[PDB]
Amino acid sequence: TRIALDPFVSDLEAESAALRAAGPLAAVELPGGVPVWAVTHHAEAKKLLTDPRLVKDINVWGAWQRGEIAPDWPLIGLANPGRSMLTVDGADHRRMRTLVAQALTPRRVEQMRERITKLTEELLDRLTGEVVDLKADFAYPLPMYVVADLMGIDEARLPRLGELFEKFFSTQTPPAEVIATLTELAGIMAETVAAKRAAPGDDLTSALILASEDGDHLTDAEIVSTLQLMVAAGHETTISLIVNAVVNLSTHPEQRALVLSGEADWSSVVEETLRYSTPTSHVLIRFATEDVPVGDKVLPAGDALIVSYGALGRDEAAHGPTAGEFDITRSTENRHISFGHGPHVCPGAALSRLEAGVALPALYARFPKLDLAVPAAELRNKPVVTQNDLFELPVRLG
Ligand code: HEM
C-alpha cells in the first residue's frame, strides 16, 4: 500500500491527490526503492515540524545505520549533507538561527526592493522576439543577480556565477564536474567573506560576520556553509515561484484580469501560487528518535519522514472545499506552510516574496497581454522528484 514517487515527475497533480488520500501519514517509496513515510495533511505536518522527536540527524535513520542504503543512491546528497543550519536541531540549531536572523533581517530584504526593481527592468529590456522562454530569459537569471548583490559577491564574478549555478542545478552535470563546481563556488564565498572582514559593508556577508549573541558568533566555515545553503535553497525555488505564478494567471484569465485591473493585489497571487503550486513538493528528511503517533498510525523509532508540502498545499481540511483550485480571492483561517513551520522555517521567505512581488508586476507592466505560447498540457516538469520546476515557459509577450 506504498506510493512510489515518479523520478520523471510525469503526473504531479495525481501523485499529490494519491498522497492526500493515503491519510496524514502515507507510506511512500523514494526513487531507488528507498521506503520512507510522508506527512501529506496540513495540521499533522505542523505537529511533526514542531516535534523535537523528528530530527535531521542521519545517525537516527535505522535503514542508513544498518547499511541498507546504496552509497551511490542518487538522493544521498539530500539525506546526508554537509553540516549546516539544515542538518542540526535543538540548541545548536537555535544558535545558528539566532545569528542568521541578525543578518537576513526583514529590513535588509526590504532594502533590496530598488536593486531588484532595477535588475527586473534590465532583464525585461533584453527580452526580444514574439515568443520567449520566460524561464530561461527572465525568471532564471533574476534570483542569481539578487543573491549575488545581497551577499556582496564581486560584480566581476557574475558571468562565471551564471555558469556555476547552471552546472550546480543541472540534471546532466556529471560526477567530478559537480565536485569542481562546489569547490569553485566555495572559493568565491570564501573570497567574499575575506573581502568583507577587510572592508565591512551593507551586505548579508558583512552582517553574518558581525552577528553575535553574548560574544558567540559564526565561524568562517559556518558563514560559508550558510551562503552556499542559501544559494542551493533559494535559486530554483524562487524561479519556480515566478514561473508558477505566470502559469497560474495564464490558465485563470479572470483572476489575471482581477490583478491587472488592480482589484486584486500581487501579494494575493504570490501567496496563492505558494499554497496551490509550491516550488518544493517534498523536503528530505527527518528521522524519529521514538515512536510518534500521527493520526491512527505510528511513525516508528528510526524511520524516515518527508514533508509533502506540494500535496498538503491543497488540503481541504485547511483551505475548505475550494482547496483543490487556484483562487487569489480565497480566505483561509489557515495560512499556507509552503515555507515550513517551527524551528526550520524558511529564512528566505521575505526575500522570495519580494523577488516575485517586484518581478510579476514589472513583467505584466511591460507585456500586459503576455500569455503561454503553448497549451498548459505541453508544459513539462523537470525530473527532480522533490521540486515542482518546468523545463521551459514558452510565452507570447503580445
Ligand atoms: C519560493 C521560494 C522558497 C521556498 C518555496 C522555500 C521553501 C523552504 C522550506 C519549505 C523550508 C523548510 C523545509 C523543512 O524544514 O521542512 C526551507 C528552508 C530553507 N530555505 Fe527556503 N524556500 C524558498 C526560498 C528561499 C530563499 C530565497 C532562501 C535564502 C535566502 C532560502 C533559504 C532557506 C534555508 C537556508 C533553509 C533552511 C532552514 C533550516 O533548516 O533551518 N529559501 N525553504
Automatic annotation (TrEMBL):
Record's keyword annotation contains Oxidoreductase: yes
CDD domains, per the entry: CYP107-like
Key word Oxidoreductase present: yes
Naturally occurring in which organism (per UniProt): Streptomyces avermitilis (strain ATCC 31267 / DSM 46492 / JCM 5070 / NBRC 14893 / NCIMB 12804 / NRRL 8165 / MA-4680)
PROSITE patterns: CYTOCHROME_P450 (PS00086)
UniProt keywords, alphabetically: Heme, Iron, Metal-binding, Monooxygenase, Oxidoreductase
Protein name, per record: Cytochrome P450 hydroxylase
Residue sites binding heme b per the record: H93, R97, R286, Y309, H344, C346
Gene assigned in the entry: cyp19
Family in the record: Belongs to the cytochrome P450 family.
Domain of life of the native organism: Bacteria
Classification via Gene3D superfamilies: Cytochrome P450
A GO term for molecular function: oxidoreductase activity, acting on paired donors, with incorporation or reduction of molecular oxygen
